[PDB]
């Protein structure tokens, strides 16, 4: 489960979600990828659940890259506490994913199994996703 | 020359839009003013382009 | 100007002198009323010109290449006395009374003192 070993500021603002991705819109490492279609915050738990889905489905061979890293801290106050008296402690680590970002990458010999593994991952994610193939530049 | 007619109310518009209409000489709905085609007046029309209609008259 | 870099082995004399010259030129500017009075100190001779940095032009100038000094008796220290005298004359001629001396990076002693004194007794106010 992915956590930053060190972060300069524990308490941070909510990463804004307007606009498209700055970059990382195209398959870079593997042969197949998951491209987001809507903005969201993907928590470190959600990335882990997706990663297990792909790796378990292929079961051997093939290599999976995770292009995004959940390094933005989100905070939550103790339950049943009135408003005020400071900010809460960080609870969830989120990667600010915007539309167009390629999140996961996968290389595998069999195309059908690759697509199936990618789809199983998508249903663990909180946004609409599309499967993209590496364009032969 | 420009024939400028005010077609929309000034209510709900920004303060500078109100002053632009006043400077053009417009004073209400359906009022008209005639001005020379000069960069200042073309600019005033553009500022309140949604509140006036401009017709080109010799 | 904006200073120069440092040097290594050779060219350290040149860089250090130039770097020193800039240090002196951050408080000594060539005005219109009192021009600059740069004085270069080479191995052979010693030149001195009266520059107008605000305009960029040079008003007067004298050196050891002039006939008055080029070939004669005396060591450098006494040889700068001629250079001091003429440049004072060539400055008095073109309407100049007060000037701002600058060392040029080298220290104020020996010829630089001697040249200054020769120019200073000729009328110019330092």
């Amino acid at each position: 489960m992915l956590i930053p070993r060190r972060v300069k500021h524990r308490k941070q603002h909510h990463p804004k979600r307007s606009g498209m991705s700055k970059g990382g819109t195209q398959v870079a490492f593997g042969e197949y990828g998951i491209q987001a279609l809507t903005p969201a915050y993907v928590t470190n738990r959600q990335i882990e659940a997706a990663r297990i889905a792909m790796t378990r489905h292929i079961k051997r061979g093939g290599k999976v890259w995770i292009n995004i890293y959940p390094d933005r801290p989100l905070t939550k106050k103790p339950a049943e506490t009135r408003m005020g008296s400071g900010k809460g402690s960080p609870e969830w680590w989120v990667a600010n994913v915007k539309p167009g970002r390629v999140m996961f990458e996968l290389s595998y010999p069999n195309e059908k199994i690759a697509r199936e593994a990618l789809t199983r991952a998508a249903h663990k994610l909180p946004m609409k996703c599309r499967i993209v193939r590496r364009e032969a530049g | 020359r420009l024939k400028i007619t005010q077609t929309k109310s000034y209510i709900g518009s920004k303060q500078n839009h109100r002053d632009t209409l006043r400077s053009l000489g417009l004073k209400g709905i359906n009022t008209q003013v005639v001005k020379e085609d000069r960069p200042e007046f073309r600019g005033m029309v553009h500022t309140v382009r949604h509140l006036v209609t401009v017709e080109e008259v010799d | 100007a904006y200073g120069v870099k440092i040097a290594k082995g050779k060219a350290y004399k040149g860089a250090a002198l130039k770097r020193r010259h800039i240090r002196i030129r951050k408080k000594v500017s060539g005005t219109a009323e009192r021009p600059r009075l740069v004085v270069t100190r080479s191995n052979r001779g010693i030149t001195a010109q009266v520059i107008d940095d605000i305009a960029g032009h040079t008003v007067a100038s004298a050196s050891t290449l002039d006939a008055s000094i080029r070939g004669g008796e005396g060591d450098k220290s006494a040889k700068a006395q001629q250079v001091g005298k003429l440049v004072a004359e060539r400055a008095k001629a073109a309407g100049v009374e007060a000037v701002v001396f600058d060392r040029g990076g080298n220290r104020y002693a020996g010829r630089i003192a001697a040249l200054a004194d020769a120019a200073r007794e000729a009328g110019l106010k330092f």
Partner: protein, 175 residues
């Protein structure tokens, strides 16, 4: 060579270009060889069919004047995929230009959990503007993990030379 009809663009800016794409035409600019850029409007559909091929040679039927051009840079909508802009570079018959050619790997890796990584999607080479090969083929059969194919390992067709240092890795095989 692909013949495509092209019109001249006179309106520039955000509003003009959006209207053009709304009409299903792709704005373009033709430059190179010290000439003043010529601003073009292109038929969107004919363009995409032509651009399916990498470094396709286009003969622009520009206002009764035919000019040779090569798509140098193309801007696509990052999400929907339709063309937004084309940069066309002038090329005369038989002059050398530097272009990127995709590499297609032939054969099947040696059996095992070996995977092929494309470190460079396209190999930069200089080739004659009219005889640009569609792709460069590489034999990777029998390769094992850790084996890396260099640029100088690629068998170029005649008339093509590398535009990158000979030691740059293009392909690699991972566990």
């Amino acid at each position: 060579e692909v013949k495509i009809t092209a019109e001249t663009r006179s309106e520039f800016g955000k509003g003009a270009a959006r209207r053009i794409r709304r009409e299903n035409k792709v704005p373009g600019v033709l430059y190179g060889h010290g000439t003043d850029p010529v601003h073009l409007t292109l038929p969107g559909h004919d363009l995409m069919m032509a651009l399916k091929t990498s470094n396709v040679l286009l003969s622009l039927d520009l206002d009764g004047k035919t000019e040779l051009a090569i798509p140098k840079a193309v801007q696509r909508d990052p999400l929907k995929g339709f063309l937004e802009h084309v940069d066309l570079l002038l090329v005369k018959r038989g002059e050398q230009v530097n272009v990127e050619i995709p590499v297609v790997t032939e054969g099947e890796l040696a059996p095992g959990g070996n995977l092929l990584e494309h470190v460079l999607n396209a190999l930069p080479v200089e080739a004659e503007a009219t005889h640009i090969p569609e792709s460069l083929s590489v034999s990777v059969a029998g390769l094992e993990a850790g084996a890396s194919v260099l640029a100088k390992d690629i068998a170029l067709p005649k008339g093509v030379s590398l535009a990158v240092e000979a030691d740059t890795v293009v392909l690699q095989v991972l566990a």
